[PDB]
């Protein structure tokens, strides 16, 4: 159609937990996003990494993305890429920007748990209540098989337990110590960092945004209730046509009762802050961020496809 999203460097979309480029080689993780961007002049590639793994380490998603980035550069003739990651994908993108600064032009994170997820702490805690530890083995096997079956390439490198640990708040803090970034504020300050970073002589434009559909709206007897602001109260069709809508409202309620404050169901506003924070006001739950569960979203939710398209134009204007 035009070149509204024509960035200088190829855009690589990076999925998070459970992800792959196409679930069962059928359902796109970034629903309708690659198509939209390409129609608007962008060169876009979608990474296919382990849906369950840590980001650092020999078998981690980081080295996987690094290797993938190199194949994209070789195929396009480009020298750098613009990394756009969702959820854990943002942490994976930070890893590549840190170890291979010369291959990255920018890093954009969408609903990325830079400080971990209180829901991860929760799930990890639940498993800890099994004195035999057997549930960790059983559930891991179940989740790992899920990863293999849904992976577009049936990637057998799945480690659900490592993935869970990676997303906890305590581990995330350690990750930030091992992979510092000028785009990050001080731990526990709920502040972002700088809009750019210069690593090894290579400058990166840093961006982020978060979904805050889940808002704490009432507290009684120690219990805190939340409201899904992405939907028209009770009657919104999104509650019926997209099962993740009520599910994230539920996990989001657990989050608020663990002191997370506004969140998207699994990532808090504070945890998602990185680089130039474009917005933390989108009335989105975690999957709305990627136009998911087939493009269904609450009546009060902004268009995620348009938001991403506009960001591509933003990158273009910024020179990357």
Q: Report the nearest approach of Na ion to the CB of residue 69 (Å).
A: 17
Binding segment (CB under 5 A) for Ca ion, from list 45-53, 218-226, 238-246, 274-282: 238-246
Q: Report the nearest approach of Na ion to the CB of residue 6 (Å).
A: 5
What is the torsional sign of CA 63, 151, 305, 255? negative
Phi, psi angle pair for 153, to nearest 5°: -115, 15
To the query of whether residue 56 is one of the catalytic residues in this protein, the response is: no
Cβ-based nearer residue to Na ion, 77 or 222? 77
Q: Which residues are annotated as a binding site for substrate?
A: 17, 88
Q: Which of Na ion, Ca ion, none does residue 288 bind (CB under 5 to 8 Å by kind)?
A: Ca ion
Pairing between strand 196-199 and 27-28? unpaired
- Residue closest to 210 by CA, chosen among 86, 35, 50, 122: 86
Count of residues of this chain found to bind Ca ion when the rule CB under 5 A is applied: 6
Give dist(CA 191, CA 83) in Å, integer: 22
To the query of whether residue 260 is one of the catalytic residues in this protein, the response is: no
E strand spans, 144-250: 196-199, 202-211, 214-220, 223-228
To the query of whether residue 204 is one of the catalytic residues in this protein, the response is: no
Phi, psi angle pair for 111, to nearest 5°: 55, 40
CB atoms within 10 A of CB 275: 24
Site string for Na ion, 6-25 (x = CB under 5 A): x-------------------
Q: Report the nearest approach of Ca ion to the CB of residue 293 (Å).
A: 5
Member of 159, 197, 242, 289 binding Ca ion (CB under 5 A): 242
Q: Which residues are catalytic?
A: 87, 264, 286
Return residues touching Ca ion (CB under 5 A). 242, 287-288, 293, 296-297
């Amino acid at each position: 159609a035009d070149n509204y999203a024509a960035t200088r460097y190829p855009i690589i979309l990076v999925h998070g937990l459970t992800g792959t480029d196409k679930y069962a080689g059928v359902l796109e993780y970034w629903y309708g996003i690659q198509e939209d961007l390409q129609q608007r002049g962008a060169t876009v590639y979608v990474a296919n990494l382990s849906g369950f793994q840590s980001d650092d380490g020999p078998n981690g998603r980081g080295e996987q993305l690094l290797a993938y980035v190199k194949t994209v550069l070789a195929a396009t003739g480009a020298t750098k890429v613009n990394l756009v990651g969702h959820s854990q994908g943002g942490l994976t993108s930070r890893y590549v920007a840190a170890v291979a600064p010369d291959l990255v032009a920018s890093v954009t994170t969408i609903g990325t748990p830079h400080r971990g997820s209180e829901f991860a702490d929760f799930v990890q805690g639940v498993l800890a209540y099994d004195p035999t530890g057997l549930s960790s083995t059983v559930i891991a096997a179940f989740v790992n098989v899920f990863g293999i079956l849904t992976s577009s390439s049936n990637n057998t490198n799945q480690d659900a337990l490592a993935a869970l640990k990676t997303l906890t708040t305590a581990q995330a803090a350690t990750y930030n110590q091992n992979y510092p970034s000028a785009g990050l504020g001080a731990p526990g300050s709920c502040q972002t960092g700088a809009p750019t970073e210069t690593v090894g002589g290579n400058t990166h434009l840093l961006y982020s945004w978060a979904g805050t559909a889940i808002q704490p709206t009432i507290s009684v007897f120690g219990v805190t209730g939340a409201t899904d602001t992405s939907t028209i109260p009770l009657v919104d069709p999104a509650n019926a046509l997209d099962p993740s809508t009520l599910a994230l409202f539920g996990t989001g309620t657990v989050m608020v009762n663990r002191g997370s404050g506004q969140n998207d169901g699994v990532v808090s506003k504070c945890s998602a802050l990185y680089g130039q924070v474009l917005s933390t006001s989108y009335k989105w739950n975690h999957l709305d961020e990627i136009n998911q569960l087939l493009g269904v979203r609450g009546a009060n939710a902004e268009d995620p496809v348009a938001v991403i398209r506009t960001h591509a134009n933003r990158l273009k204007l910024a020179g990357v």
